[PDB]
Short mmCIF file of C-alpha atoms and ligand atoms in Angstrom, two decimals:
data_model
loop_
_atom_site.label_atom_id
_atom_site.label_comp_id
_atom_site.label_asym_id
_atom_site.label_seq_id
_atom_site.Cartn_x
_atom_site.Cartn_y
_atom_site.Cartn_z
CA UNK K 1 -57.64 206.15 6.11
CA UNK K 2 -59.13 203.43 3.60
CA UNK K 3 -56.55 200.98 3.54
CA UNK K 4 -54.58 199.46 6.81
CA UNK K 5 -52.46 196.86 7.12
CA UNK K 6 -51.85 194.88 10.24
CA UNK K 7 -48.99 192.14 10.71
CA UNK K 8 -48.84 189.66 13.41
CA UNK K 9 -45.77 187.00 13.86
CA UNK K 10 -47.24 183.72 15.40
CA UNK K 11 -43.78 182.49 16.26
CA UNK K 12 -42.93 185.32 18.57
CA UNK K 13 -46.22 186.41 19.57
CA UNK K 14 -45.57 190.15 18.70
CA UNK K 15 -46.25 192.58 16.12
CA UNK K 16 -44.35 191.68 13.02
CA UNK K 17 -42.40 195.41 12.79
CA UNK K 18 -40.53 197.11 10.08
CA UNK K 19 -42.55 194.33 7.35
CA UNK K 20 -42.44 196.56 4.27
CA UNK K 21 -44.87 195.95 1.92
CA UNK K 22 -46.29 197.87 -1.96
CA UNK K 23 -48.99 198.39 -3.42
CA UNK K 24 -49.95 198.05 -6.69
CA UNK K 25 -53.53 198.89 -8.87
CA UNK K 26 -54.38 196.77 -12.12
CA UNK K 27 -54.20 198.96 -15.20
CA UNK K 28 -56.24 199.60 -18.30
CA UNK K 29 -53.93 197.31 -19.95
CA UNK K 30 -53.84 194.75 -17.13
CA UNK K 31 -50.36 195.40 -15.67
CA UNK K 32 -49.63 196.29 -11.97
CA UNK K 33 -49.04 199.86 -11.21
CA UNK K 34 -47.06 200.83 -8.07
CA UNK K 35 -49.40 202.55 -6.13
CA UNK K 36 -48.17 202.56 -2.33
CA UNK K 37 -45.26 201.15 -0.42
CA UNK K 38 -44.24 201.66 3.43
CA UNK K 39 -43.43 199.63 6.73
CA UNK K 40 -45.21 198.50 9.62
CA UNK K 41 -44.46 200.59 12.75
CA UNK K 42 -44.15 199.03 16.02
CA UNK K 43 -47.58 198.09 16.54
CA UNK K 44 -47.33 196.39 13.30
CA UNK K 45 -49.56 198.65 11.18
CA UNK K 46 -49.08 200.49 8.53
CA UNK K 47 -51.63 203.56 7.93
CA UNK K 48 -51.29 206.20 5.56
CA UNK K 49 -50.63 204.27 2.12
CA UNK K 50 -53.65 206.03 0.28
CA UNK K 51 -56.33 208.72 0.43
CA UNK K 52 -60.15 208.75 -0.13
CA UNK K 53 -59.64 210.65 -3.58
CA UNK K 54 -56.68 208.36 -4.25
CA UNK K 55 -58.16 205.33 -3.76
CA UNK K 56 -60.57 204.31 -6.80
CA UNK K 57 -62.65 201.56 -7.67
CA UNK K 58 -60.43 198.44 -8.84
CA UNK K 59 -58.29 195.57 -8.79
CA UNK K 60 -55.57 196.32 -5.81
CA UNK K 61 -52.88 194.09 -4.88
CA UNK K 62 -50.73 194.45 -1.16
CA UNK K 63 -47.41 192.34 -1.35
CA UNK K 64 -46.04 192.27 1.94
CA UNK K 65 -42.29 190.99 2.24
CA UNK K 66 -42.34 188.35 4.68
CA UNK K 67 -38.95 186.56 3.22
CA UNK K 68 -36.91 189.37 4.41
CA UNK K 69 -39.06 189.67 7.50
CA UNK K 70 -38.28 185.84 8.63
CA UNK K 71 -34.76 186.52 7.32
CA UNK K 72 -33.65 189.05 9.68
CA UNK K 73 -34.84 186.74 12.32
CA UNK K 74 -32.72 183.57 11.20
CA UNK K 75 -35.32 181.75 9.76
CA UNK K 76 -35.33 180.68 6.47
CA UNK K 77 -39.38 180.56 5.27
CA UNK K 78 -41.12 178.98 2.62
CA UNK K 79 -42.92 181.88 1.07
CA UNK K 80 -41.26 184.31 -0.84
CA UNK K 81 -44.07 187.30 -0.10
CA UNK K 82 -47.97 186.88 1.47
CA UNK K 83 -49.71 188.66 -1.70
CA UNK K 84 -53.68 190.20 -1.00
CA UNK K 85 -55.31 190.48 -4.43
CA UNK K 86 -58.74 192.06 -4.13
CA UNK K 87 -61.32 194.30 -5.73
CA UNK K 88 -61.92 197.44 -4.01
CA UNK K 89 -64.71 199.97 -3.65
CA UNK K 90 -67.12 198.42 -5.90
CA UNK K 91 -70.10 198.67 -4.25
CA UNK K 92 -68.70 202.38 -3.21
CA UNK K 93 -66.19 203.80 -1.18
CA UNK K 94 -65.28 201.55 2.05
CA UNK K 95 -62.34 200.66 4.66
CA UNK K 96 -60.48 198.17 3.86
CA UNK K 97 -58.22 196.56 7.41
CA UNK K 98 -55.95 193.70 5.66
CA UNK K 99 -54.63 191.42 8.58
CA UNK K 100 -51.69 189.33 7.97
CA UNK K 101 -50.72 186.54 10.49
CA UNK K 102 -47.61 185.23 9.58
CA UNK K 103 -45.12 181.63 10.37
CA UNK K 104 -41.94 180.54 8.56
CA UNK K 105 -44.04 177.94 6.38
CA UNK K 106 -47.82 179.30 6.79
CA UNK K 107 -49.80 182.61 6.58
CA UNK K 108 -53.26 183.62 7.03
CA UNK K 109 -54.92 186.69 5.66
CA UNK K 110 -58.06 188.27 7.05
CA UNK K 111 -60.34 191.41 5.53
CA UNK K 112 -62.30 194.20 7.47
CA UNK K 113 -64.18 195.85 5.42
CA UNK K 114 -66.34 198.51 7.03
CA UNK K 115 -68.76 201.76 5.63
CA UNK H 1 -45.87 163.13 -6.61
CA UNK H 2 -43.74 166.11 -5.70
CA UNK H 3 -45.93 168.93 -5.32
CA UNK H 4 -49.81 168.30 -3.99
CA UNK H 5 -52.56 170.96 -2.92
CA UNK H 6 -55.34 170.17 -0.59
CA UNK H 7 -58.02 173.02 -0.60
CA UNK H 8 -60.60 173.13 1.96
CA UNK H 9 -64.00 175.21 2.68
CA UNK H 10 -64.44 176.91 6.20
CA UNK H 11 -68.02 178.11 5.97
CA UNK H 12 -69.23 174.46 4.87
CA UNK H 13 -66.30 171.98 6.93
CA UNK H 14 -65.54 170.34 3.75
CA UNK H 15 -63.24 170.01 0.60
CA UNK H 16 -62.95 172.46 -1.54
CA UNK H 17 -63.85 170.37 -4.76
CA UNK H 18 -63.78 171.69 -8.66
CA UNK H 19 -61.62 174.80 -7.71
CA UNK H 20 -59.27 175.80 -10.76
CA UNK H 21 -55.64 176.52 -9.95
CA UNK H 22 -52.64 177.38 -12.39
CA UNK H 23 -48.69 176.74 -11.25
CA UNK H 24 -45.84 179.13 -12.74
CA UNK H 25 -42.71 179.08 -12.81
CA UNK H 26 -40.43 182.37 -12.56
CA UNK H 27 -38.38 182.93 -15.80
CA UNK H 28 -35.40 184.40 -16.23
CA UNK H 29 -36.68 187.37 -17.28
CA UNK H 30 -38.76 187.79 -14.31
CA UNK H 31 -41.79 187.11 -15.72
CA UNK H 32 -44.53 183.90 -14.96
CA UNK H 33 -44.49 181.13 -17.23
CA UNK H 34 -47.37 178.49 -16.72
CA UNK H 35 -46.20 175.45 -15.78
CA UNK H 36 -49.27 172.98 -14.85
CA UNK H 37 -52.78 173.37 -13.80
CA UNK H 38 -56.18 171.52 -12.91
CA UNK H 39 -59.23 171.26 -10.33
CA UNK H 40 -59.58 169.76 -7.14
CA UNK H 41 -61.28 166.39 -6.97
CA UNK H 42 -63.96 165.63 -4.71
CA UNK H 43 -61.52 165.06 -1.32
CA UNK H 44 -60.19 168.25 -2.09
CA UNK H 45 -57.19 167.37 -3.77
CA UNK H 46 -55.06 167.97 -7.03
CA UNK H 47 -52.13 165.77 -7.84
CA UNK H 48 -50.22 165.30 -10.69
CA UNK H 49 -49.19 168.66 -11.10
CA UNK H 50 -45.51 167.63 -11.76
CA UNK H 51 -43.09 165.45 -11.75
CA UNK H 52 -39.39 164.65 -10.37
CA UNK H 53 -37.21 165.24 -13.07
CA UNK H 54 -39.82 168.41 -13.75
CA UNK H 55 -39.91 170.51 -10.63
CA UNK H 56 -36.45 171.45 -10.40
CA UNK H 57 -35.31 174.52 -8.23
CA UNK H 58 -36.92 177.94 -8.68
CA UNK H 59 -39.47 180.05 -7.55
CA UNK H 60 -42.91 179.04 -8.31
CA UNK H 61 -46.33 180.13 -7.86
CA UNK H 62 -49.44 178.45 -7.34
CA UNK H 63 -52.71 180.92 -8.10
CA UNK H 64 -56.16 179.74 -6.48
CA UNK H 65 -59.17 180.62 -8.03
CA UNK H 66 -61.01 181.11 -5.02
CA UNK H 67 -63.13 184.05 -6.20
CA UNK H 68 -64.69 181.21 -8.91
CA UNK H 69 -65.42 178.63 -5.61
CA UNK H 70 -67.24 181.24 -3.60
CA UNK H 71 -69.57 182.79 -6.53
CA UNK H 72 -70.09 178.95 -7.59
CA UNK H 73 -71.61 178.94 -3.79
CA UNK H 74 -73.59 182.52 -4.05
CA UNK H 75 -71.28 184.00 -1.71
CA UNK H 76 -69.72 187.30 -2.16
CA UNK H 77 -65.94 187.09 -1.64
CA UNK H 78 -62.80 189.73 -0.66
CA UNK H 79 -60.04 187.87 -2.42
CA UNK H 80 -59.75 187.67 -6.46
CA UNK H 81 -57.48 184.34 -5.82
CA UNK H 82 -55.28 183.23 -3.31
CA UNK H 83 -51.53 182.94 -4.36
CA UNK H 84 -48.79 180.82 -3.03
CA UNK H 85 -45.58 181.72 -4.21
CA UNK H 86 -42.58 180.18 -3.16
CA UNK H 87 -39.00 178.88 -3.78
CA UNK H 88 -38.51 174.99 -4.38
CA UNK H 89 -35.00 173.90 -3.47
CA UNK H 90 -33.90 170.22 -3.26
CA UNK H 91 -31.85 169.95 -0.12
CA UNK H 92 -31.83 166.27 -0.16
CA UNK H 93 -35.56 164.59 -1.20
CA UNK H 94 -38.44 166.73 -0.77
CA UNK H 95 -42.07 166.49 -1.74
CA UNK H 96 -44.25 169.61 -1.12
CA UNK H 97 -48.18 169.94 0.21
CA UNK H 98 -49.51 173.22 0.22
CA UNK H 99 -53.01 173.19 2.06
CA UNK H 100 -55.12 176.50 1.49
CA UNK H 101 -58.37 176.85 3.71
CA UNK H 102 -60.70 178.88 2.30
CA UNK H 103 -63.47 181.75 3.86
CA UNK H 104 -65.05 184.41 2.27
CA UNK H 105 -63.05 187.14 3.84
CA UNK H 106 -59.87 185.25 4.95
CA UNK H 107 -57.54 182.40 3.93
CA UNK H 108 -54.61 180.76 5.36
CA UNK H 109 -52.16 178.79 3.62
CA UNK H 110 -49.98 176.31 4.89
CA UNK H 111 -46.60 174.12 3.39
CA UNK H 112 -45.77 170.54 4.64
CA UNK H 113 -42.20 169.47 3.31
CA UNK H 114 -41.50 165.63 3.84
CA UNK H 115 -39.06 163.72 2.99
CA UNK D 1 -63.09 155.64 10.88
CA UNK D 2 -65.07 158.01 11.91
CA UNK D 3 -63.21 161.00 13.74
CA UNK D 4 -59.42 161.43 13.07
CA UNK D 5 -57.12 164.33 13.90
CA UNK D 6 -54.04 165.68 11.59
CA UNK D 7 -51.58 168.26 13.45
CA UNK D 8 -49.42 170.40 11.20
CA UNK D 9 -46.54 173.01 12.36
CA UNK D 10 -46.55 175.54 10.79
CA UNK D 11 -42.48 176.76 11.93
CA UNK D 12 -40.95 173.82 10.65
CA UNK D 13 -43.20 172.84 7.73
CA UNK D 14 -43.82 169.73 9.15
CA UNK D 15 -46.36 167.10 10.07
CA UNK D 16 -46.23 167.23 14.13
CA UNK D 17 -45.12 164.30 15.17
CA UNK D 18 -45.58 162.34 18.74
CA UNK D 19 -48.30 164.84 19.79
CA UNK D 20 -50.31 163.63 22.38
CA UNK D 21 -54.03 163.97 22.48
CA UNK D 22 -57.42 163.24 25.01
CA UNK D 23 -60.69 162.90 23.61
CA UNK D 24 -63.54 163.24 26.17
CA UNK D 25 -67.58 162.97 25.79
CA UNK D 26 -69.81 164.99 28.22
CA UNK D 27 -71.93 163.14 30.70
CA UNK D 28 -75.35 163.85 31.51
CA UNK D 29 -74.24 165.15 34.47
CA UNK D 30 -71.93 168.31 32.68
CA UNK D 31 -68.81 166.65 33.52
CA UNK D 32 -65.69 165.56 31.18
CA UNK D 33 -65.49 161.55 30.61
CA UNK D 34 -62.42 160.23 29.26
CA UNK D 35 -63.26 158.43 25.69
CA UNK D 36 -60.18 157.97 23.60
CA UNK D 37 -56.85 159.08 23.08
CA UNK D 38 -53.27 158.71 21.58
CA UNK D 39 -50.58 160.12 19.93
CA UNK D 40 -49.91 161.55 16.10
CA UNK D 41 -48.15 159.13 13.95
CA UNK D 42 -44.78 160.57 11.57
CA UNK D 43 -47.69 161.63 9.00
CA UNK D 44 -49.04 164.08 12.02
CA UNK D 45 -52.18 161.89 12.50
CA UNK D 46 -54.16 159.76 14.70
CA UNK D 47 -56.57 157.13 13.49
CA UNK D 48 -58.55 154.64 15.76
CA UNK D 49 -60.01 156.84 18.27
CA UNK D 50 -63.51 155.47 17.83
CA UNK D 51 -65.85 153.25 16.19
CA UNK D 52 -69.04 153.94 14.61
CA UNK D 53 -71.39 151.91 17.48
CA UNK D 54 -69.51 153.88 19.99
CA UNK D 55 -69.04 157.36 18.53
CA UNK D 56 -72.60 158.57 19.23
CA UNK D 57 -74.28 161.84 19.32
CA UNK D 58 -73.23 164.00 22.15
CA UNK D 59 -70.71 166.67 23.03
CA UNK D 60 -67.20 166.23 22.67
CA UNK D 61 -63.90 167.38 23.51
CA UNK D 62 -60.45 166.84 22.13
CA UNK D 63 -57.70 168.60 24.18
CA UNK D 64 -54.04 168.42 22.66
CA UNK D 65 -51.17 168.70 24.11
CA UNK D 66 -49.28 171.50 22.60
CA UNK D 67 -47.62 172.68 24.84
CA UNK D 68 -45.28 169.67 25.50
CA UNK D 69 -44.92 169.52 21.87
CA UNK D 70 -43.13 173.08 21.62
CA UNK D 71 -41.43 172.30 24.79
CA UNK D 72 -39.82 169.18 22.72
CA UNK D 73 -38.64 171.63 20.60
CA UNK D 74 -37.01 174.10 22.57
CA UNK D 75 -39.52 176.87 21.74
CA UNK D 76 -41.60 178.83 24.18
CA UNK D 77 -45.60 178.34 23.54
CA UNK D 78 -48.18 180.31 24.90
CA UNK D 79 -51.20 177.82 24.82
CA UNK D 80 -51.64 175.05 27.43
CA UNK D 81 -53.12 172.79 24.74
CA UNK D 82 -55.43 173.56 21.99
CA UNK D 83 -59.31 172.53 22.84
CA UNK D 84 -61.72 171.64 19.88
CA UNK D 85 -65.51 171.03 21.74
CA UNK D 86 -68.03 170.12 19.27
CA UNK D 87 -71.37 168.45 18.94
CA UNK D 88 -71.64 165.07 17.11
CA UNK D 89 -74.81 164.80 14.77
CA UNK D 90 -75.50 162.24 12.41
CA UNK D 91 -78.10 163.43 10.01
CA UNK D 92 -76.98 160.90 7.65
CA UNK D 93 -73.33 159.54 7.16
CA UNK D 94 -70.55 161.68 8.77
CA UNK D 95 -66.97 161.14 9.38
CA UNK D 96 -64.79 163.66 10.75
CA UNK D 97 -61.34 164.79 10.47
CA UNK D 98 -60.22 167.70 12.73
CA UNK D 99 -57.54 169.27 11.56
CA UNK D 100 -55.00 171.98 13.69
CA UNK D 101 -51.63 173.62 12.62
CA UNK D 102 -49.75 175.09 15.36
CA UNK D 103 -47.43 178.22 15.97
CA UNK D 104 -46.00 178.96 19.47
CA UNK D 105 -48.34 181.75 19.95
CA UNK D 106 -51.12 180.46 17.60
CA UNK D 107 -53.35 177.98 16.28
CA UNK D 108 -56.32 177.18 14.63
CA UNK D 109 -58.73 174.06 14.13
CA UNK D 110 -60.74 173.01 11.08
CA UNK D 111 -63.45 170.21 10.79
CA UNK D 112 -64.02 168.46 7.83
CA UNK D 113 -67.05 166.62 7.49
CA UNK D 114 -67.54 164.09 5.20
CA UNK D 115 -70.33 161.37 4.01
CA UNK C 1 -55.47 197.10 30.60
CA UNK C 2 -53.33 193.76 30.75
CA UNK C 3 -55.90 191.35 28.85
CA UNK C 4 -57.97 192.23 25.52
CA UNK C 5 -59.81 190.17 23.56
CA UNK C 6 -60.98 190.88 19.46
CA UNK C 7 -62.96 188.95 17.81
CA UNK C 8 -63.37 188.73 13.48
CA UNK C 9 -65.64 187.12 11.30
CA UNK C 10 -64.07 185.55 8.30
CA UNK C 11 -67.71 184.92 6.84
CA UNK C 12 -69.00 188.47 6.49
CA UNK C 13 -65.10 190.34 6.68
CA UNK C 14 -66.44 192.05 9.70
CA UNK C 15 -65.70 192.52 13.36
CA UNK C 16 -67.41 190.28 15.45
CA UNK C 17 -69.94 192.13 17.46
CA UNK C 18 -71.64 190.78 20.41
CA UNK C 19 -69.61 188.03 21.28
CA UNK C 20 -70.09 186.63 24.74
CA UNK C 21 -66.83 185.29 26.63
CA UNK C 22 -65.92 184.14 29.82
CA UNK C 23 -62.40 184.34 31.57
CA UNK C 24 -61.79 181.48 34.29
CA UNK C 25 -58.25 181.26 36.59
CA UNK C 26 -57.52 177.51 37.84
CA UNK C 27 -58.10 177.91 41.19
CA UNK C 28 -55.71 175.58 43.95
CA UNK C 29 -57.95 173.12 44.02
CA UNK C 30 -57.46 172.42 40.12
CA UNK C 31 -60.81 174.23 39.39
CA UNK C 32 -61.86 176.23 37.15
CA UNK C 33 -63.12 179.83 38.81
CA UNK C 34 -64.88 182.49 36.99
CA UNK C 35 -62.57 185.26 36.89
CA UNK C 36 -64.44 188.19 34.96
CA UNK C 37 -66.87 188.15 31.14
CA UNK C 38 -68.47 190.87 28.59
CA UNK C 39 -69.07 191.22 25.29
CA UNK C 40 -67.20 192.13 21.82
CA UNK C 41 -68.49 195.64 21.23
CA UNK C 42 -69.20 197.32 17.91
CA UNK C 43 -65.22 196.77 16.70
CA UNK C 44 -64.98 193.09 17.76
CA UNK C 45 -63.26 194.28 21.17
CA UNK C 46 -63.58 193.36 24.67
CA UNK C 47 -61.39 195.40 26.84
CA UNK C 48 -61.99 196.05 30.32
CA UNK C 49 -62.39 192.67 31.89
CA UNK C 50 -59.17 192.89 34.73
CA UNK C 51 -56.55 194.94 36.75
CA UNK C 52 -52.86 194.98 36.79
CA UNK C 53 -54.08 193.85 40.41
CA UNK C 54 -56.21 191.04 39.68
CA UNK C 55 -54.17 189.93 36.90
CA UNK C 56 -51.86 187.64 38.83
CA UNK C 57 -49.91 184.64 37.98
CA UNK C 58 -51.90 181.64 36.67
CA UNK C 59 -53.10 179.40 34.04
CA UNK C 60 -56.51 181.39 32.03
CA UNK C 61 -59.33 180.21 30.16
CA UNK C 62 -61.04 182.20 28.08
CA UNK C 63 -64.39 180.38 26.50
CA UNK C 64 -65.55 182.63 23.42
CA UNK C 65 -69.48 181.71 22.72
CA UNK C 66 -68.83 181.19 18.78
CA UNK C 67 -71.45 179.02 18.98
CA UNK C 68 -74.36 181.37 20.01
CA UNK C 69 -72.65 184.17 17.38
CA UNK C 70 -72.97 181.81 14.60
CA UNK C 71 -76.16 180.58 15.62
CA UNK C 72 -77.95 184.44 15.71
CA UNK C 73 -76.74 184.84 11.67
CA UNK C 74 -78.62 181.41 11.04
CA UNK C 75 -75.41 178.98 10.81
CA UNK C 76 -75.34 176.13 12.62
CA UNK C 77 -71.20 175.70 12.93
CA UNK C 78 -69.21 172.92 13.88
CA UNK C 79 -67.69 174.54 17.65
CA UNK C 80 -69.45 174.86 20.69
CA UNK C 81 -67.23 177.72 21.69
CA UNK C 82 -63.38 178.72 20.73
CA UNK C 83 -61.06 178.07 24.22
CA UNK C 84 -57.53 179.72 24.87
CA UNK C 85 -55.70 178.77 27.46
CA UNK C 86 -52.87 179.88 28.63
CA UNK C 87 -50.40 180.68 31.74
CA UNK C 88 -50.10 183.86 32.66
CA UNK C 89 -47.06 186.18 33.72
CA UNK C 90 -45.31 183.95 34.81
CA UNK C 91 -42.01 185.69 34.00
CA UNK C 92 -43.68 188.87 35.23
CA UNK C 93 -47.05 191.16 34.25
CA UNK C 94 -47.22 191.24 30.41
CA UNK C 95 -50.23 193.06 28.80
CA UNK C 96 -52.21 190.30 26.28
CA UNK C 97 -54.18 190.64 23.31
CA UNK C 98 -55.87 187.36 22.49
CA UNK C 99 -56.98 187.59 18.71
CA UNK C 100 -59.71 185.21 17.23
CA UNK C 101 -61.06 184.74 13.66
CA UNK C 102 -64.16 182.61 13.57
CA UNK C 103 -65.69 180.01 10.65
CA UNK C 104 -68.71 178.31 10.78
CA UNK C 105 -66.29 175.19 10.79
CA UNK C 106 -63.10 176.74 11.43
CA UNK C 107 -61.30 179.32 14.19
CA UNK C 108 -57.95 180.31 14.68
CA UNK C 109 -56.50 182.08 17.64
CA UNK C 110 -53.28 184.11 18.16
CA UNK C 111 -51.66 185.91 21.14
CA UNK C 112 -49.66 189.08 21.18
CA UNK C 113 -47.85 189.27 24.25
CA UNK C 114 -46.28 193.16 25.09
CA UNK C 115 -44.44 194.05 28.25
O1 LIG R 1 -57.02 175.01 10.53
C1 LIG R 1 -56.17 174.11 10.28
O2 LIG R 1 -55.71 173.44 11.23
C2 LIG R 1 -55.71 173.82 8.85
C3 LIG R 1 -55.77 172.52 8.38
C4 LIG R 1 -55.35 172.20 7.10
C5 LIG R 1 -55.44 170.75 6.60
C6 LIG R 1 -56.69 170.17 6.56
C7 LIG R 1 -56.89 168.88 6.11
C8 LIG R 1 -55.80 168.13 5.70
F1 LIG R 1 -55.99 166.85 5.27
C9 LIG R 1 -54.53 168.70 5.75
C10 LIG R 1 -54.35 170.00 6.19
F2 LIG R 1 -53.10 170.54 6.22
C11 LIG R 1 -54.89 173.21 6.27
C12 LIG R 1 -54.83 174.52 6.73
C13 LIG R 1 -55.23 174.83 8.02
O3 LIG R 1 -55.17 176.15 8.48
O1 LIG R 2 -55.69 183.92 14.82
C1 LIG R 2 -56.50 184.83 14.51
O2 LIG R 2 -57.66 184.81 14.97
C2 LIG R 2 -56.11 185.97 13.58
C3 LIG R 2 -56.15 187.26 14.07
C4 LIG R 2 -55.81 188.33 13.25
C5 LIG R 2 -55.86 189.74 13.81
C6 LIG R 2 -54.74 190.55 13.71
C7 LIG R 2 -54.77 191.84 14.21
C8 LIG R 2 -55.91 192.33 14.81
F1 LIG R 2 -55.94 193.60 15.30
C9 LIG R 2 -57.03 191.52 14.91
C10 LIG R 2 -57.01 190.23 14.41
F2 LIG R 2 -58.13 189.45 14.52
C11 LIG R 2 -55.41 188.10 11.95
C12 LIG R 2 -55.36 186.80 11.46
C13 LIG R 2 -55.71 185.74 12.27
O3 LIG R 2 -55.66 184.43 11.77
#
């Protein structure tokens, strides 16, 4: 599994669960692809979005739908999405963990990235 | 001043000074028009982005160049930028702050709406 | 001015207002002494802890009072306060401005450090 | 296992490895009591450290040596160590995962609390 996503809501102190998020992969003629898409489960992860083969060298972007996520609960937030833009696999193939606290009117984003 | 960003370093526990950022604002067509830009000064700050009769309602985006800050520093980054996107809406007078604190694998970013 | 604190919250997008704060200095004898304290303006800060003569080299500790702050609020925290305990060291000019945004069940601290 | 700790670096987008922490329980005497310690292991975890038993109602410290990790990668960083504190099922046993991601100048902590 190279790429994981973990959400965690700082309000309620929980997993942030059923936070759908996509995918996408610059192209040769710099647009964003759709790549990926799925929901965190009740630990707040989501696993599974891509394989090793899958998962080439380039310019990846996760948008994670935190609007509708704070929206369900009865808050209205400030951002419309958290959005992780990163290069991937450059150096070579590696494991990417994304980590996504999130608040009505703040996020933080965190990287593991391990051989 | 309506809309201010603060930018600040983790690894070194100070501004964030000469980072580039570009505002845009969503079209009707769905697509990002620029809208205003400019560095941070040395206290970490840009103003002037914008003005009242300017920064009406929409959503807007704010795009850090972080990846810029971090190779000025020799340090290799995860992020390409950091991106704040978000929906203005007057709801009686509001000026916004967005504060972004910058590490090399992480940021979290943060919206103060005062009156 | 040398040290000043700025408290954010991050639910309501707001300076935190009213929130109290201890600073202590540790003795030679590994106990907490009582040094300054106060309360966060409506800007979510707190000048005038200190003065340079006094605000020597040593270990210090600034405990504030989040909890009481969510409990103003309604909301349950976890935290009994959030601690920042840091070393003082002037190797030339320094002023410092500790910064902290809360969440109910988070919150992190930043130093910026400044000639 | 009612009370985990995980530590992340934000500098090198890695767990944090090693870490040393101590867990104190305010005793009735309004002391401090050591309660149980270890270290992060090779995925920034610490598990292990109480019981269901032991884990009683009460107000917990846990000190995180940031200080000492920063200091064996050659930073010198602002913290002496990161502190949560916190009460404890109060409402009955919950199991805890306290989450930290460390700076040189910066940390932020987060709790998720599970039943
Ligand atoms: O760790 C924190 O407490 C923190 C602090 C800030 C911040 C810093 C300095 C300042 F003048 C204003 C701020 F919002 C911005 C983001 C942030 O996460
Ligand atoms: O407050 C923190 O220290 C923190 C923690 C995480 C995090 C989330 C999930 C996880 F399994 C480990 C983490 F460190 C993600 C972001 C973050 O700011």
């Amino acid at each position: 599994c190279p790429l994981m996503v973990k959400v965690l809501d700082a309000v309620r102190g929980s997993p942030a669960i059923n936070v759908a998020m996509h995918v996408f992969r610059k192209a040769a003629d710099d647009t964003w692809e759709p790549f990926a898409s799925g929901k965190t489960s009740e630990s707040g992860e989501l696993h599974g979005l891509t394989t090793e083969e899958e998962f080439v060298e380039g310019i990846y972007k996760v948008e994670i739908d935190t609007k509708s996520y704070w929206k369900a609960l009865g808050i209205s937030p400030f951002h419309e999405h958290a959005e992780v833009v990163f290069t991937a696999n450059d150096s070579g193939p590696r494991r990417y963990t994304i980590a996504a606290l999130l608040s009505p009117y703040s996020y933080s984003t965190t990287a593991v990235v391990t051989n």
